[PDB]
Amino acid sequence: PLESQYQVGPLLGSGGFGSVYSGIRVSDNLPVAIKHVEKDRISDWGELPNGTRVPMEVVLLKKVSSGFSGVIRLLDWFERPDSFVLILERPEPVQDLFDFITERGALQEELARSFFWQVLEAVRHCHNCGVLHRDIKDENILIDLNRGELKLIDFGSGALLKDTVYTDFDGTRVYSPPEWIRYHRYHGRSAAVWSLGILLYDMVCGDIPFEHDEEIIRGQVFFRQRVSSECQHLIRWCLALRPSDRPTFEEIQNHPWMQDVLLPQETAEIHLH
Numbered sequence: 572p573l574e575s576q577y578q579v580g581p582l583l584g585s586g587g588f589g590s591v592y593s594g595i596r597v598s599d600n601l602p603v604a605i606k607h608v609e610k611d612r613i614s615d616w617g618e619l620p621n622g623t624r625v626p627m628e629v630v631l632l633k634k635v636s637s638g639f640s641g642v643i644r645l646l647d648w649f650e651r652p653d654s655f656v657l658i659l660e661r662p663e664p665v666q667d668l669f670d671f672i673t674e675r676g677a678l679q680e681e682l683a684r685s686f687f688w689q690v691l692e693a694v695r696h697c698h699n700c701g702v703l704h705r706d707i708k709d710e711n712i713l714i715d716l717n718r719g720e721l722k723l724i725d726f727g728s729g730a731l732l733k734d735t736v737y738t739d740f741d742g743t744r745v746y747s748p749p750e751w752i753r754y755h756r757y758h759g760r761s762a763a764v765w766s767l768g769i770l771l772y773d774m775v776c777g778d779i780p781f782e783h784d785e786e787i788i789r790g791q792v793f794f795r796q797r798v799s800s801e802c803q804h805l806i807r808w809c810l811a812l813r814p815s816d817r818p819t820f821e822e823i824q825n826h827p828w829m830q831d832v833l834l835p836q837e838t839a840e841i842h843l844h
């Protein structure tokens with residue numbers, strides 16, 4: 572069983588998402604993360620291609636868990652009487668982007684460009700797989716420090732991607748768009764672009780741009796750090812008040828600020844090693 576298959580290490584974190592432990596798969600010593608989610612705390616349920624009742628998080632992880640290393644892979648899952656247990660891949664050494672920015676401050680634009688580009692490729696992979704993450708933020712991005720590769724984590728607030736309006740949201744409010752704050756309605760892709768604008772500002776400024784609902788609604792972007800005109804333009808574009816005024820993923824990646832991105836290995840060599 573699960574208890575014999577894995578060696579439980581220390582607690583990595585806990586919160587709204589449940590409890591995550593560091594672990595090692597006993598068969599090949601593979602580093603893993605073991606996430607426990609209480610059944611009474613799971614509101615969104617779904618079903619696998621076969622039809623088993625599992626948390627939506629398990630459905631979304633299976634839809635995205637393949638070759639591409641930009642999303643944390645689900646290796647296995649187990650059902651207990653009062654909880655679900657998820658076995659996830661674990662990079663080592665690792666640091667989440669929130670801890671990284673907290674320690675190092677505002678990122679050099681070359682580093683933010685490499686990181687932001689990788690988040691964009693990871694989000695495009697999710698959307699291509701029919702998955703909307705809904706909680707893109709620094710805390711949900713892991714940095715594989717040796718490879719300079721970023722990985723999206725925590726699909727616990729996610730949903731299947733659709734072209735119609737969403738009227739439910741349980742992600743992070745300070746990353747949520749003005750249409751959600753004002754109308755409790757949003758479309759998946761343009762809400763994801765707004766959160767990406769919040770994240771890019773966070774990378775280049777060292778903190779998020781808005782704290783209160785009133786600021787999100789006003790959408791006036793003030794730069795507290797020295798940021799290039801091209802980067803400021805891209806941020807202000809992702810943070811357009813009208814969802815239809817926001818760039819598509821293609822327009823973000825074709826933006827002049829996004830040109831000449833470093834490869835992840837070059838990024839680790841210059842900025843992380």
Ligand SMILES: c1cncc(-c2nc3ccccc3[nH]2)c1
Nearest residue numbers: 588591604643659660661724725
């Ligand atoms: C919050 C919510 N859901 C999952 C996590 C999570 N997954 C991980 C995978 C590897 C290492 C650390 C990890 N932390 C954190």
